[PDB]
C-alpha cells in the first residue's frame, strides 16, 4: 500500500474466503521483523483460520518493540493496544525511503495523552482537548490543557530509532465457525475404514474414519463427545458426515 494509516487512526482490512499462501510472505526477504505469538512463523502455512484481520500503521523505530502483548508506553497504552492472548504475527520493516521527507513528513500522527488506557483493539479518533489539571479548559489549549495528538518528524538524517517503520499486524481468530482462510496445502483422496492421520480443516488427530449416522444440522461442522473432545467431523469438500 501507498497510503498507510496513522497509528492513532489505524486502518483495518478484513481478509476472508480465500487461500492464504504464507510462504511468499514468510519467505520474503523484505521484512525486518516477523515475530509470531500463539503460532510459529514457519508452520503458518499448514493452519486454517476463521478470518484474519490485517491492521496497519506507521510508528517510530524505537516503538516497534511496543507492538507486542504485555507492553507499555505511549503507543501501547493510547494508540494501539494488543491483547495478551493475541494469536497472530507482528510484521514491521524500515520504510525511511517511502515515508521520510527531507523537511520531515508530518502526516503520521499519534495520540500522546489520554484519560485512560485503551482496551484491546479499541480505537479513539476524537480530538478532545486533554485535561491535565483541575481547571476546565473550555476548549482552549495552554498549560494543563493539552492537544492529544502529535506528529513524528521523519527526516532522512534521523537515527535508526527515529526512522519510520511500517507495521502490519495480522490477527488470527480461532472461533467455532466455518474456516475461510487456509494455507496453500494440497488435498489427498479420502480414505475410510483404515487407521490414518487426519487433518480436517485444521482438526488433527489419529484414527479410523467411518460413515456416521448422526443427524447434523446444516450449520454444524464437527461434534464433540461428553468429554468435550472431537468425535465427529463434516468433510470440508463434500458435505458428508464422518464419525472419527
Amino acid at each position, epitope marked *: 500500500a501507498t497510503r498507510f494509516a496513522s497509528v492513532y487512526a489505524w486502518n483495518r482490512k478484513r481478509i476472508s474466503n480465500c487461500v492464504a499462501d504464507y510462504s511468499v510472505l514468510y519467505n*520474503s*526477504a*523484505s521484512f525486518s521483523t516477523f515475530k509470531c505469538y500463539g503460532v510459529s512463523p514457519t508452520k503458518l502455512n499448514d493452519l486454517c483460520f476463521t478470518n484474519v484481520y490485517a491492521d496497519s500503521f506507521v510508528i517510530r523505530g524505537d516503538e516497534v518493540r511496543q507492538i507486542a502483548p504485555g507492553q507499555t508506553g505511549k503507543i501501547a497504552d493510547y494508540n494501539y493496544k494488543l491483547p495478551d492472548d493475541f494469536t497472530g504475527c507482528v510484521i514491521a520493516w524500515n520504510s525511511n*525511503n*517511502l515515508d521520510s521527507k527531507v523537511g520531515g513528513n508530518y502526516n503520521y500522527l499519534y495520540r500522546l495523552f489520554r484519560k485512560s488506557n485503551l482496551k484491546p483493539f479499541e480505537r479513539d479518533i476524537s480530538t478532545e482537548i486533554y485535561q491535565a489539571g483541575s481547571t476546565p479548559c473550555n476548549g482552549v489549549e495552554g498549560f494543563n490543557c493539552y492537544f492529544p495528538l502529535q506528529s513524528y518528524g521523519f527526516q*532522512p538524517t534521523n537515527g535508526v530509532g527515529y526512522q519510520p517503520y511500517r507495521v502490519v499486524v495480522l490477527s488470527f481468530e480461532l472461533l467455532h465457525a466455518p474456516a475461510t482462510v487456509c494455507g496453500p496445502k494440497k488435498s489427498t483422496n479420502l480414505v475410510k475404514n483404515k487407521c490414518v492421520n487426519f487433518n480436517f480443516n485444521g482438526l488433527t488427530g489419529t484414527g479410523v474414519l467411518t460413515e456416521s449416522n448422526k443427524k447434523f444440522l446444516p450449520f454444524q461442522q464437527f461434534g464433540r463427545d461428553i468429554a468435550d473432545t472431537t468425535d465427529a467431523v463434516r468433510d470440508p469438500q463434500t458435505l458428508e458426515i464422518l464419525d472419527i
Partner: nanobody
Framework: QVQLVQSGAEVKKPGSSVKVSCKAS????????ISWVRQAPGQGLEWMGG????????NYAQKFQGRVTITADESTSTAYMELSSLRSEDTAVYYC???????????????????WGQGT
C-alpha cells in the same frame, strides 16, 4: 516497449559542471537499478555510479566519489546526474543504463543491462 532516452550532447570548457538527464518511458519505474557508466575514446568502459530510485540512495566509485552527484526524480520518472570539476581526461560519451528487477527488491536479484541510452 520500455526504453531510456536522455538529453543531447553538451560541450563544456574545463573546470565547469555538467548535468545529464535520463528519461524513462514504459514499465514500472523506481524499481530499476539505474546505473551510470562511461567509456573513454579508445578505452574500455569505466563505472562511476548507480542509483535505485525507490531507496533514494546513490553509490559512487572511489575515483569519482566527492565529484559526482546522482539523483533520481520519481515524480517525472527521470534520473539526473551532476558532474563537477571536469578535466581534460574526463571528456567521453556518457551512457544511462538500467537493470530489470525481480525478487524481494531489497536484496540484489537483477537481470542484465538489456536497455541503454543513446549517448551524451
Amino acid at each position: 516497449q520500455v526504453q531510456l532516452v536522455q538529453s543531447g550532447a553538451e560541450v563544456k570548457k574545463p573546470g565547469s559542471s555538467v548535468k545529464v538527464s535520463c528519461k524513462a518511458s514504459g514499465g514500472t519505474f523506481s524499481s530499476y537499478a539505474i546505473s551510470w557508466v562511461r567509456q573513454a575514446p579508445g578505452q574500455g568502459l569505466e563505472w562511476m555510479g548507480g542509483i535505485i530510485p525507490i531507496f533514494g540512495t546513490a553509490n559512487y566509485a572511489q575515483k569519482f566519489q566527492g565529484r559526482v552527484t546522482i539523483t533520481a526524480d520519481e515524480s517525472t520518472s527521470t534520473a539526473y546526474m551532476e558532474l563537477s570539476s571536469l578535466r581534460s581526461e574526463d571528456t567521453a560519451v556518457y551512457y544511462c543504463a538500467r537493470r530489470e528487477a525481480y525478487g524481494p527488491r531489497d536484496y540484489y536479484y537483477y537481470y542484465g543491462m538489456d536497455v541503454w541510452g543513446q549517448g551524451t
